[PDB]
Amino acid sequence: MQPNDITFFQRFQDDILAGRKTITIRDESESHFKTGDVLRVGRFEDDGYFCTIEVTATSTVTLDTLTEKHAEQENMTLTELKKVIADIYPGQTQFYVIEFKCL
Numbered sequence: 001m002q003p004n005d006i007t008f009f010q011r012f013q014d015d016i017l018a019g020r021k022t023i024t025i026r027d028e029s030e031s032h033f034k035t036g037d038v039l040r041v042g043r044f045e046d047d048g049y050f051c052t053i054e055v056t057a058t059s060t061v062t063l064d065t066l067t068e069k070h071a072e073q074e075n076m077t078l079t080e081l082k083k084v085i086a087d088i089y090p091g092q093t094q095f096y097v098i099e100f101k102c103l
Helices: 010-017 068-073 078-088
Strands: 022-026 038-043 047-061 095-101
Touching: 010 022, 010 038, 010 047, 010 068, 010 078, 022 047, 068 078
Parallel strands: none
Antiparallel strands: 022 095, 038 047, 047 095
């Protein structure tokens, strides 16, 4: 068996399945894989490590600073944002962002 690399809320996962490259956010203390590598994708709901993806680029920024939270912020309400945020992870402070694309 093997652990997962990075997860993505159901919403994020679905959007991922729709392709459209997207950026991710990780914690240095949890610095997972790196660029030019593979990023195991999976739904946190209960579909973790479902498929595999590859990184494309990386950067250092917050969450809503790019995370879907932004697209949602300008779409959904605070509640929803808090829902996804809670589905993604707590803490609204700068962090590591890793971009990837679906081959």
